[PDB]
Amino acid sequence: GSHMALSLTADQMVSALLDAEPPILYSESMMGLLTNLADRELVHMINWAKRVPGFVDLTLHDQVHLLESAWLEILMIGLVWRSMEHPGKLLFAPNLLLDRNQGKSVEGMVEIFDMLLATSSRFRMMNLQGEEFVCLKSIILLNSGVYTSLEEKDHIHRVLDKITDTLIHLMAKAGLTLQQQHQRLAQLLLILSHIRHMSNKGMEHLYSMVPSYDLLLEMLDAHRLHAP
Amino acid sequence: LSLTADQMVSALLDAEPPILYSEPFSEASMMGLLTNLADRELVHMINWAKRVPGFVDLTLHDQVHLLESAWLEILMIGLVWRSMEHPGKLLFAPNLLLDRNQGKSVEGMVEIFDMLLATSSRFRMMNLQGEEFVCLKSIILLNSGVYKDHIHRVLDKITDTLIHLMAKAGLTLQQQHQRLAQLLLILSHIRHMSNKGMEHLYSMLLEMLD
Ligand SMILES: Cc1cc(F)ccc1-c1c(Cc2ccc(/C=C/C(=O)O)cc2)c2ccc(O)cc2oc1=O
Ligand SMILES: Cc1cc(F)ccc1-c1c(Cc2ccc(/C=C/C(=O)O)cc2)c2ccc(O)cc2oc1=O
């Protein structure tokens, strides 16, 4: 059978997102290594993205739009998640744990590094859970590009409300008061604005030294050819 | 800090800057007109910043950084608010209502226009209220240069304040959290616009604060 996204309970949404997680990939000149990693991560992101409840309900063209706006933020949230148990360090991959100082070997890279580090330490001191993380990553995929067919927008927003509900359930089951539930949610959603900022600074940097709409369309298209 | 939700709102409503006026247009004239308008609003913005509860308690360094980081986001949300009832147009001032065609007269400008219009169309579709608006505007000032325990206390207070307005208007407990989220996710898109806007402006405080 098939569960429509707007029918999911909070626990079924959490279970769907946890089950969709991509694996942690390994690293194979700093930049060449990072690009290869991202490239490989990308193929997996696509598989993940189609398992986000509500995503395949959209037109294909709308799917690519959302993925074109969100892809670098998604890479980044994952990076900051992996880096959480390693203060001062970015875990690009387990064989590629880089610190602030190595970052200074690439011009302008330290600033983004420091932004990424600060986001990671904020997640750490907030004690972000795995179950919250997956909610935030999905929110990113659905939200980044939604402000740039009226039924598609409404549907995307209704799925966003569902993940929000799911985040509130997690916080209520963790014992937070209503005030605390609202404040932590707000705090998590503001971190998302900073992740957007990081992404834009990241993109500026990449264009100055990248998946287009057309490649992501092709990669989305290619997914349908995968052997199950 | 000590204030109630009512007092916070009241304070925010009282601190609101005025709507300024602009002083047929060419490209260079339209941009001079927008520049001079924004220059004039920045003065009032600094003044409004100082009346935001919690802001002057920060160090002057933190006050300058937040404002330097957030000024365009603030200009932009004020614009999107003003333009809300004007489908397909940006109300930069009552005497400077500009349509999508008018923005095509400067290289790169129209892309930002569309993004501003979408934001504005989104606040209309949501029925953004004045009191919610002022809360969001203050969240932007406190959030945009944030990444310190004190900033986050004020933020939590504004969150609480937004929720109380929502409660006051009869929204269920689920509707409240849903709406709060929908609004703070708009803040992501406003940050993005600011970034795009800054990029374009490179393709060309200490006093009022101290
Ligand atoms: C650290 C950094 C600085 C930038 F300034 C731009 C991007 C990054 C960055 C990369 C590096 C990166 C390098 C190249 C590309 C290019 C992709 C492509 O060409 O398809 C993408 C990311 C990254 C790679 C893998 C990953 O899991 C997370 C990451 O998070 C980041 O913030
Ligand atoms: C529409 C736009 C496109 C850009 F690409 C950059 C900024 C804007 C923009 C401006 C125009 C603007 C033009 C010049 C300057 C400053 C120039 C300078 O200091 O030299 C600032 C704003 C603006 C002006 C007043 C206002 O209330 C809101 C506004 O919102 C915007 O998004």
Tab-separated table of N, CA and C in Angstrom, chain B residues 6-135:
chain	number	residue	atom	x	y	z
B	6	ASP	N	1.985	41.912	26.565
B	6	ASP	CA	1.277	43.136	26.190
B	6	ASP	C	2.234	44.321	26.102
B	7	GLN	N	3.077	44.450	27.127
B	7	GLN	CA	4.051	45.535	27.222
B	7	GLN	C	5.093	45.461	26.111
B	8	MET	N	5.514	44.244	25.802
B	8	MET	CA	6.497	44.009	24.753
B	8	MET	C	5.951	44.475	23.413
B	9	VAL	N	4.759	44.015	23.092
B	9	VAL	CA	4.052	44.400	21.889
B	9	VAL	C	3.890	45.893	21.798
B	10	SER	N	3.414	46.468	22.901
B	10	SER	CA	3.153	47.898	23.029
B	10	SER	C	4.416	48.652	22.720
B	11	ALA	N	5.509	48.260	23.383
B	11	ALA	CA	6.805	48.888	23.194
B	11	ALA	C	7.207	48.802	21.725
B	12	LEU	N	7.089	47.607	21.149
B	12	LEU	CA	7.416	47.419	19.729
B	12	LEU	C	6.560	48.306	18.837
B	13	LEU	N	5.243	48.318	19.062
B	13	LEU	CA	4.364	49.178	18.260
B	13	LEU	C	4.712	50.664	18.361
B	14	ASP	N	4.982	51.137	19.570
B	14	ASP	CA	5.408	52.530	19.794
B	14	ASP	C	6.735	52.910	19.132
B	15	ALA	N	7.657	51.946	19.042
B	15	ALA	CA	8.999	52.211	18.492
B	15	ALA	C	9.063	52.239	16.961
B	16	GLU	N	7.980	51.842	16.287
B	16	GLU	CA	7.940	51.730	14.834
B	16	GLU	C	8.421	53.004	14.164
B	17	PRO	N	9.357	52.898	13.209
B	17	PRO	CA	9.703	54.069	12.429
B	17	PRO	C	8.525	54.510	11.557
B	18	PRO	N	8.562	55.753	11.054
B	18	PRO	CA	7.597	56.214	10.081
B	18	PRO	C	7.860	55.648	8.679
B	19	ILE	N	6.908	55.851	7.793
B	19	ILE	CA	7.035	55.481	6.402
B	19	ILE	C	7.524	56.728	5.722
B	20	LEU	N	8.580	56.605	4.953
B	20	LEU	CA	9.192	57.770	4.358
B	20	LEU	C	8.766	57.815	2.918
B	21	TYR	N	8.885	59.002	2.345
B	21	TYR	CA	8.631	59.217	0.933
B	21	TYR	C	9.910	59.205	0.146
B	22	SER	N	9.804	58.858	-1.130
B	22	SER	CA	10.840	59.154	-2.089
B	22	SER	C	10.967	60.678	-2.200
B	23	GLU	N	12.135	61.152	-2.611
B	23	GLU	CA	12.293	62.577	-2.902
B	23	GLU	C	11.380	62.970	-4.079
B	24	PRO	N	8.676	60.444	-14.406
B	24	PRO	CA	9.135	59.136	-14.908
B	24	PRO	C	10.636	58.951	-14.704
B	25	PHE	N	11.038	57.717	-14.423
B	25	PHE	CA	12.404	57.414	-13.960
B	25	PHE	C	13.236	56.703	-15.031
B	26	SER	N	14.530	57.005	-15.040
B	26	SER	CA	15.510	56.174	-15.727
B	26	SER	C	16.125	55.194	-14.715
B	27	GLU	N	16.955	54.293	-15.211
B	27	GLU	CA	17.608	53.281	-14.385
B	27	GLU	C	18.486	53.916	-13.283
B	28	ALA	N	19.319	54.888	-13.679
B	28	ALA	CA	20.238	55.553	-12.761
B	28	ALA	C	19.459	56.407	-11.775
B	29	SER	N	18.376	57.021	-12.236
B	29	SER	CA	17.531	57.809	-11.342
B	29	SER	C	16.758	56.909	-10.350
B	30	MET	N	16.242	55.758	-10.810
B	30	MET	CA	15.481	54.819	-9.956
B	30	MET	C	16.372	54.320	-8.826
B	31	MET	N	17.624	54.047	-9.164
B	31	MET	CA	18.581	53.550	-8.191
B	31	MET	C	19.092	54.615	-7.213
B	32	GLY	N	19.303	55.817	-7.703
B	32	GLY	CA	19.551	56.945	-6.826
B	32	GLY	C	18.378	57.179	-5.877
B	33	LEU	N	17.162	57.141	-6.432
B	33	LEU	CA	15.946	57.277	-5.639
B	33	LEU	C	15.850	56.203	-4.537
B	34	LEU	N	16.078	54.959	-4.890
B	34	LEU	CA	16.089	53.876	-3.883
B	34	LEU	C	17.190	54.000	-2.847
B	35	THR	N	18.390	54.387	-3.294
B	35	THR	CA	19.555	54.594	-2.417
B	35	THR	C	19.321	55.703	-1.387
B	36	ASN	N	18.924	56.884	-1.860
B	36	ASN	CA	18.562	57.985	-0.978
B	36	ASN	C	17.442	57.642	-0.006
B	37	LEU	N	16.447	56.886	-0.469
B	37	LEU	CA	15.364	56.439	0.417
B	37	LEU	C	15.920	55.499	1.515
B	38	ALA	N	16.699	54.513	1.125
B	38	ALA	CA	17.242	53.587	2.103
B	38	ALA	C	18.210	54.302	3.106
B	39	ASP	N	18.952	55.279	2.604
B	39	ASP	CA	19.883	56.039	3.453
B	39	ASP	C	19.105	56.733	4.560
B	40	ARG	N	17.998	57.375	4.163
B	40	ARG	CA	17.108	58.042	5.120
B	40	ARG	C	16.414	57.061	6.105
B	41	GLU	N	15.966	55.903	5.625
B	41	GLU	CA	15.366	54.940	6.539
B	41	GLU	C	16.378	54.343	7.535
B	42	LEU	N	17.635	54.256	7.137
B	42	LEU	CA	18.645	53.664	8.010
B	42	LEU	C	18.820	54.459	9.301
B	43	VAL	N	18.672	55.764	9.210
B	43	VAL	CA	18.731	56.628	10.396
B	43	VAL	C	17.627	56.290	11.407
B	44	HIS	N	16.401	56.203	10.914
B	44	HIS	CA	15.258	55.830	11.709
B	44	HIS	C	15.366	54.395	12.240
B	45	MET	N	15.962	53.510	11.431
B	45	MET	CA	16.140	52.133	11.809
B	45	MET	C	17.024	52.026	13.028
B	46	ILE	N	18.123	52.781	13.029
B	46	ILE	CA	19.051	52.778	14.154
B	46	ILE	C	18.301	53.191	15.424
B	47	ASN	N	17.577	54.293	15.324
B	47	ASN	CA	16.659	54.730	16.366
B	47	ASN	C	15.629	53.728	16.867
B	48	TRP	N	15.063	52.971	15.933
B	48	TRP	CA	14.112	51.922	16.294
B	48	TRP	C	14.832	50.796	16.990
B	49	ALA	N	16.013	50.450	16.477
B	49	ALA	CA	16.853	49.413	17.074
B	49	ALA	C	17.053	49.695	18.556
B	50	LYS	N	17.401	50.941	18.889
B	50	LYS	CA	17.653	51.295	20.302
B	50	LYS	C	16.438	51.160	21.224
B	51	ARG	N	15.248	51.207	20.657
B	51	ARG	CA	14.018	51.056	21.415
B	51	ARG	C	13.488	49.629	21.479
B	52	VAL	N	14.185	48.682	20.854
B	52	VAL	CA	13.837	47.276	20.932
B	52	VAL	C	14.283	46.730	22.291
B	53	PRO	N	13.353	46.186	23.091
B	53	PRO	CA	13.733	45.739	24.428
B	53	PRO	C	14.881	44.733	24.449
B	54	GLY	N	15.921	45.075	25.205
B	54	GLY	CA	17.153	44.281	25.285
B	54	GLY	C	18.349	44.786	24.471
B	55	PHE	N	18.095	45.643	23.480
B	55	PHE	CA	19.136	46.011	22.531
B	55	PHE	C	20.247	46.931	23.072
B	56	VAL	N	19.879	48.001	23.777
B	56	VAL	CA	20.927	48.918	24.310
B	56	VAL	C	21.762	48.293	25.436
B	57	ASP	N	21.203	47.281	26.118
B	57	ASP	CA	21.932	46.464	27.096
B	57	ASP	C	23.113	45.707	26.535
B	58	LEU	N	23.110	45.433	25.230
B	58	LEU	CA	24.277	44.858	24.573
B	58	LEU	C	25.420	45.856	24.541
B	59	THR	N	26.622	45.334	24.335
B	59	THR	CA	27.814	46.171	24.096
B	59	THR	C	27.681	46.865	22.739
B	60	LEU	N	28.300	48.038	22.593
B	60	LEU	CA	28.198	48.824	21.355
B	60	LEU	C	28.694	48.054	20.130
B	61	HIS	N	29.717	47.228	20.346
B	61	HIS	CA	30.245	46.277	19.342
B	61	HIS	C	29.173	45.296	18.884
B	62	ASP	N	28.411	44.749	19.817
B	62	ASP	CA	27.359	43.804	19.451
B	62	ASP	C	26.199	44.530	18.761
B	63	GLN	N	25.883	45.734	19.216
B	63	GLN	CA	24.846	46.537	18.595
B	63	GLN	C	25.174	46.903	17.096
B	64	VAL	N	26.414	47.306	16.838
B	64	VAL	CA	26.888	47.605	15.496
B	64	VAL	C	26.890	46.395	14.582
B	65	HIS	N	27.310	45.244	15.120
B	65	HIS	CA	27.403	44.036	14.342
B	65	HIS	C	26.011	43.593	13.932
B	66	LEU	N	25.062	43.539	14.870
B	66	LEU	CA	23.682	43.081	14.536
B	66	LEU	C	23.029	43.932	13.450
B	67	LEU	N	23.114	45.237	13.629
B	67	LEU	CA	22.629	46.232	12.659
B	67	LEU	C	23.334	46.161	11.296
B	68	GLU	N	24.658	46.071	11.311
B	68	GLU	CA	25.431	45.893	10.071
B	68	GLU	C	25.055	44.605	9.367
B	69	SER	N	24.806	43.554	10.129
B	69	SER	CA	24.437	42.288	9.527
B	69	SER	C	22.987	42.270	9.005
B	70	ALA	N	22.104	42.989	9.683
B	70	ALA	CA	20.642	42.833	9.474
B	70	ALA	C	19.943	43.960	8.703
B	71	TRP	N	20.626	45.084	8.431
B	71	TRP	CA	19.940	46.316	7.925
B	71	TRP	C	19.086	46.076	6.663
B	72	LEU	N	19.615	45.340	5.680
B	72	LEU	CA	18.871	45.100	4.462
B	72	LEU	C	17.666	44.144	4.699
B	73	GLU	N	17.861	43.085	5.480
B	73	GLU	CA	16.779	42.203	5.870
B	73	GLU	C	15.645	43.027	6.460
B	74	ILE	N	16.015	43.994	7.316
B	74	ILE	CA	15.040	44.878	7.957
B	74	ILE	C	14.361	45.804	6.952
B	75	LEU	N	15.134	46.380	6.072
B	75	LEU	CA	14.529	47.223	5.041
B	75	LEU	C	13.533	46.429	4.210
B	76	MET	N	13.957	45.207	3.869
B	76	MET	CA	13.219	44.319	3.031
B	76	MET	C	11.894	43.819	3.623
B	77	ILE	N	11.883	43.448	4.906
B	77	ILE	CA	10.633	42.991	5.559
B	77	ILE	C	9.641	44.157	5.712
B	78	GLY	N	10.163	45.351	5.987
B	78	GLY	CA	9.379	46.581	5.996
B	78	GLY	C	8.770	46.841	4.615
B	79	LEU	N	9.574	46.672	3.586
B	79	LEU	CA	9.037	46.737	2.196
B	79	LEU	C	7.925	45.707	1.837
B	80	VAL	N	8.124	44.459	2.255
B	80	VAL	CA	7.236	43.335	1.996
B	80	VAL	C	5.930	43.514	2.754
B	81	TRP	N	6.052	44.022	3.984
B	81	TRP	CA	4.886	44.444	4.765
B	81	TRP	C	4.088	45.575	4.113
B	82	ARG	N	4.768	46.649	3.739
B	82	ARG	CA	4.116	47.737	3.042
B	82	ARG	C	3.461	47.327	1.713
B	83	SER	N	4.067	46.367	1.008
B	83	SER	CA	3.608	45.954	-0.341
B	83	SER	C	2.498	44.853	-0.337
B	84	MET	N	1.976	44.517	0.832
B	84	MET	CA	1.202	43.311	1.001
B	84	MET	C	-0.130	43.332	0.253
B	85	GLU	N	-0.817	44.467	0.285
B	85	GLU	CA	-2.121	44.650	-0.371
B	85	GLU	C	-1.980	45.046	-1.855
B	86	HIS	N	-0.738	45.114	-2.372
B	86	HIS	CA	-0.445	45.592	-3.741
B	86	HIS	C	0.190	44.484	-4.637
B	87	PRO	N	-0.633	43.497	-5.031
B	87	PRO	CA	-0.291	42.422	-5.920
B	87	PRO	C	0.511	42.878	-7.127
B	88	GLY	N	1.707	42.326	-7.295
B	88	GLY	CA	2.536	42.610	-8.454
B	88	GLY	C	3.303	43.916	-8.349
B	89	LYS	N	3.353	44.513	-7.164
B	89	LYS	CA	4.039	45.798	-6.991
B	89	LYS	C	4.745	45.906	-5.655
B	90	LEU	N	5.870	46.639	-5.651
B	90	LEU	CA	6.622	46.914	-4.416
B	90	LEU	C	6.429	48.394	-3.993
B	91	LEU	N	5.937	48.578	-2.783
B	91	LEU	CA	5.592	49.894	-2.288
B	91	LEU	C	6.818	50.325	-1.501
B	92	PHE	N	7.839	50.802	-2.203
B	92	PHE	CA	9.065	51.283	-1.521
B	92	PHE	C	8.752	52.547	-0.726
B	93	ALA	N	7.886	53.402	-1.274
B	93	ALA	CA	7.313	54.546	-0.547
B	93	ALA	C	5.935	54.822	-1.154
B	94	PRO	N	5.050	55.527	-0.434
B	94	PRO	CA	3.725	55.846	-1.036
B	94	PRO	C	3.803	56.528	-2.419
B	95	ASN	N	4.866	57.296	-2.659
B	95	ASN	CA	5.113	57.930	-3.948
B	95	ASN	C	6.158	57.192	-4.791
B	96	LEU	N	6.379	55.899	-4.497
B	96	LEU	CA	7.307	55.070	-5.236
B	96	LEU	C	6.859	53.617	-5.163
B	97	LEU	N	5.754	53.367	-5.867
B	97	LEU	CA	5.148	52.070	-6.066
B	97	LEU	C	5.653	51.530	-7.403
B	98	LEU	N	6.425	50.449	-7.368
B	98	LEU	CA	7.125	49.975	-8.567
B	98	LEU	C	6.709	48.565	-8.938
B	99	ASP	N	6.413	48.366	-10.224
B	99	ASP	CA	5.948	47.078	-10.743
B	99	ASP	C	7.096	46.286	-11.336
B	100	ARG	N	6.844	45.000	-11.572
B	100	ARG	CA	7.819	44.054	-12.126
B	100	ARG	C	8.507	44.578	-13.396
B	101	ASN	N	7.752	45.239	-14.268
B	101	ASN	CA	8.341	45.808	-15.498
B	101	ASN	C	9.388	46.892	-15.170
B	102	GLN	N	9.082	47.779	-14.212
B	102	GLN	CA	10.007	48.839	-13.780
B	102	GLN	C	11.372	48.330	-13.244
B	103	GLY	N	11.365	47.189	-12.554
B	103	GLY	CA	12.600	46.549	-12.091
B	103	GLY	C	13.510	45.944	-13.161
B	104	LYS	N	12.956	45.630	-14.334
B	104	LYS	CA	13.738	45.093	-15.467
B	104	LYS	C	14.690	46.132	-16.087
B	105	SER	N	14.498	47.407	-15.739
B	105	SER	CA	15.342	48.511	-16.210
B	105	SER	C	16.725	48.622	-15.519
B	106	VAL	N	17.028	47.731	-14.560
B	106	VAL	CA	18.392	47.602	-13.999
B	106	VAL	C	18.863	46.137	-13.980
B	107	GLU	N	20.058	45.902	-14.527
B	107	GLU	CA	20.625	44.552	-14.672
B	107	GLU	C	20.723	43.779	-13.335
B	108	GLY	N	19.928	42.718	-13.220
B	108	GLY	CA	19.931	41.824	-12.051
B	108	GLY	C	18.817	42.101	-11.054
B	109	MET	N	18.184	43.250	-11.222
B	109	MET	CA	17.246	43.778	-10.266
B	109	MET	C	15.955	42.961	-10.231
B	110	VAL	N	15.474	42.522	-11.387
B	110	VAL	CA	14.138	41.919	-11.451
B	110	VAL	C	14.045	40.586	-10.697
B	111	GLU	N	15.133	39.826	-10.663
B	111	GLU	CA	15.136	38.562	-9.927
B	111	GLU	C	14.797	38.800	-8.452
B	112	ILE	N	15.450	39.786	-7.836
B	112	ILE	CA	15.142	40.209	-6.454
B	112	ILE	C	13.672	40.701	-6.307
B	113	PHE	N	13.225	41.583	-7.197
B	113	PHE	CA	11.792	41.936	-7.300
B	113	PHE	C	10.835	40.738	-7.144
B	114	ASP	N	11.066	39.661	-7.902
B	114	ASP	CA	10.161	38.506	-7.874
B	114	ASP	C	10.169	37.859	-6.540
B	115	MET	N	11.343	37.809	-5.941
B	115	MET	CA	11.492	37.248	-4.629
B	115	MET	C	10.792	38.113	-3.562
B	116	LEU	N	10.907	39.423	-3.681
B	116	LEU	CA	10.194	40.319	-2.779
B	116	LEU	C	8.637	40.125	-2.917
B	117	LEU	N	8.144	40.104	-4.147
B	117	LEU	CA	6.701	39.883	-4.448
B	117	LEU	C	6.125	38.593	-3.902
B	118	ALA	N	6.901	37.525	-3.984
B	118	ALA	CA	6.527	36.249	-3.422
B	118	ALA	C	6.451	36.273	-1.919
B	119	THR	N	7.428	36.919	-1.287
B	119	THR	CA	7.366	37.077	0.144
B	119	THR	C	6.112	37.826	0.584
B	120	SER	N	5.819	38.903	-0.132
B	120	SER	CA	4.676	39.782	0.137
B	120	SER	C	3.353	38.995	-0.105
B	121	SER	N	3.304	38.283	-1.209
B	121	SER	CA	2.142	37.420	-1.509
B	121	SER	C	1.969	36.342	-0.421
B	122	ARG	N	3.086	35.830	0.105
B	122	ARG	CA	3.013	34.902	1.227
B	122	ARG	C	2.492	35.512	2.559
B	123	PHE	N	2.841	36.739	2.877
B	123	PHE	CA	2.297	37.368	4.104
B	123	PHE	C	0.822	37.698	3.980
B	124	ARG	N	0.384	38.023	2.769
B	124	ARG	CA	-1.039	38.274	2.492
B	124	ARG	C	-1.832	36.989	2.677
B	125	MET	N	-1.405	35.946	1.977
B	125	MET	CA	-2.028	34.634	2.070
B	125	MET	C	-2.096	34.088	3.518
B	126	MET	N	-1.133	34.505	4.352
B	126	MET	CA	-1.082	34.178	5.785
B	126	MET	C	-1.824	35.112	6.699
B	127	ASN	N	-2.230	36.277	6.191
B	127	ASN	CA	-2.867	37.332	6.996
B	127	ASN	C	-1.995	37.845	8.142
B	128	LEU	N	-0.723	38.162	7.822
B	128	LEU	CA	0.199	38.721	8.795
B	128	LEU	C	-0.396	39.934	9.459
B	129	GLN	N	-0.352	39.977	10.786
B	129	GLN	CA	-0.834	41.108	11.530
B	129	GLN	C	0.321	42.039	11.981
B	130	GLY	N	-0.025	43.317	12.152
B	130	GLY	CA	0.906	44.313	12.607
B	130	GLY	C	1.805	43.869	13.730
B	131	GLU	N	1.178	43.353	14.784
B	131	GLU	CA	1.854	42.926	16.006
B	131	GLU	C	2.833	41.772	15.790
B	132	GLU	N	2.454	40.856	14.885
B	132	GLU	CA	3.306	39.740	14.445
B	132	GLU	C	4.481	40.279	13.667
B	133	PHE	N	4.208	41.181	12.718
B	133	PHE	CA	5.222	41.872	11.934
B	133	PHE	C	6.352	42.474	12.818
B	134	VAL	N	5.977	43.255	13.834
B	134	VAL	CA	6.980	43.935	14.680
B	134	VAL	C	7.825	42.917	15.479
B	135	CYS	N	7.191	41.814	15.850
B	135	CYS	CA	7.915	40.743	16.509
B	135	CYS	C	8.952	40.141	15.581
